[PDB]
Amino acid sequence: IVDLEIQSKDKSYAWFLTWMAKHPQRVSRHLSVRTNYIQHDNGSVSTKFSLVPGPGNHWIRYKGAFILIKRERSAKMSPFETVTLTTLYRDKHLFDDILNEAKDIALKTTEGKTVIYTSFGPEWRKFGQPKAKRMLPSVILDSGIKEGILDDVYDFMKNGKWYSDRGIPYRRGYLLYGPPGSGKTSFIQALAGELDYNICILNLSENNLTDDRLNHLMNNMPERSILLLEDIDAASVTFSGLLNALDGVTSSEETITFMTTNHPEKLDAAIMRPGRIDYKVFVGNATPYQVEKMFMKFYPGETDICKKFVNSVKELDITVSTAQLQGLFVMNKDAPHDALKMVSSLRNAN
């Protein structure tokens, strides 16, 4: 006479909880409190709260169906521990409808953002609230680097069947090696935002990490995601295990991985094999083109001032980094003349 369902620790779990929370026909017999700080921009800041439903029996009149819901935790909980949700009714033709509406609520939040996933044991999870996309034009790189990388990535993503027809693993890996503050990770963020993919950052120096855990993580990544290995030169994981995971029998399929270093010389030949690192790019220090385009980005319209600024930078004869230029422009916010005056500050480093 009635039908039921269970779910715990799942993508739809939080989506479901959010959908229950917003719904106006909630008859929540048990409540909780979630305190949060509300920021009225720079005008003022105050603290407020929201009475999230608590654990127990709750009724909802979902468009003509009296649905009962039950939230309960395990014997204990903040290390991970299972929490399950149940839902009760005779007819299930509204069940999938509620689940789809929860999906829609989830999609609304992750509209103009890029989700970040982190390694926690053999599976991933979202880390913090999503962040806004770093649009590619903001990332100033040397001429042709951005365009070449984008063309390579689009060619790889589009040519899916072509790999299979010729018996190659449909997996590609990119390397961005260069000095610090050269825009590497910024470009990773921007490319992920452009493709609408989600970055799955992974730290191999993590001691609790193991080869089996590594293989499971790289095989159970969420779809439409990019793997990121910041400072792959850092190297419980084993060298052979890593090599096999990147390119080997246990290696996954339909994945894109990005690696970054400041010391590419440390990396051996096997890791730099084309099968593992197909594309390698030198994200070097700032060049006059990069300096000019950064100046236009921070001081748009100021052309002659740009010309004098780049001439002065050239005359200084310094290996200025891009981040140094960003810091200088941030000091002299909306003050191109002040930036021109302080241009000499880039020479000093300590």
Ligand X SMILES: Nc1ncnc2c1ncn2[C@@H]1O[C@H](COP(=O)(O)OP(=O)(O)OP(O)(O)=S)[C@@H](O)[C@H]1O
Query: Does 179 carry a binding-site annotation?
Result: yes
Please report whether residue 326 would count as binding ligand X according to CB under 6 A: yes
Rounded CA-CA distance 276/173 in Å is 6
Instruction: Pick one of 24, 180, 208, 334: the residue that binds ligand X (CB under 6 A).
Output: 180
CB of 202 to ligand X, least distance (A): 13
Rounded CA-CA distance 259/196 in Å is 19
Amino acid at 14: A
Please report whether residue 198 would count as binding ligand X according to CB under 6 A: no
Please report whether residue 142 would count as binding ligand X according to CB under 6 A: no
The residue among 53 and 183 lying less far from ligand X, judged by its C-beta, is 183
Binder of residue 293, out of a second copy, ligand X, none (CB less than 5 to 8 A by kind): none
Q: Would you say the C-alpha torsion 148, 149, 151, 152 has a positive or negative sign? A: positive
Max CA pair span of the chain: 85
Residue 138 phi/psi, 5-degree rounding, is: -65, -35
The residue among 60 and 173 lying less far from a second copy, judged by its C-beta, is 173
Query: Does 185 carry a binding-site annotation?
Result: yes
CB of 340 to a second copy, least distance (A): 18
Select from 28, 89, 83, 78 the least CA-distant residue to 53: 28
Binder of residue 75, out of ligand X, a second copy, none (CB less than 5 to 8 A by kind): none
Please report whether residue 284 would count as binding ligand X according to CB under 6 A: no
Rule CB under 6 A: which of 239-258 touch ligand X?
A: 247-248
- Partnered with residue 190 across adjacent β-strands are none
Query: Does 287 carry a binding-site annotation?
Result: no
For the chain, the C-alpha Rg in angstroms (whole number) is 25
Binder of residue 212, out of ligand X, a second copy, none (CB less than 5 to 8 A by kind): a second copy
Select from 321, 344, 320 the least CA-distant residue to 332: 344
The residue among 231 and 312 lying less far from a second copy, judged by its C-beta, is 231
**What are the distances in angstroms from CA 268 to CA 1, 27, 179, 250, 263?**
66, 62, 19, 21, 11
The residue among 195 and 305 lying less far from a second copy, judged by its C-beta, is 195
Amino acid at 323: A
Rounded CA-CA distance 293/300 in Å is 9
Amino acid at 44: S
Binder of residue 78, out of ligand X, a second copy, none (CB less than 5 to 8 A by kind): none
Token reading at 43: 């005008």
Binder of residue 42, out of a second copy, ligand X, none (CB less than 5 to 8 A by kind): a second copy
CB of 195 to ligand X, least distance (A): 18
Binding residues: 178-185
Which residues sit at the interface with ligand X, rule CB under 6 A?
Answer: 138-141, 168-169, 180-186, 230, 247-248, 260, 262, 275, 322-323, 326
Binding residues for ATP: 178-185
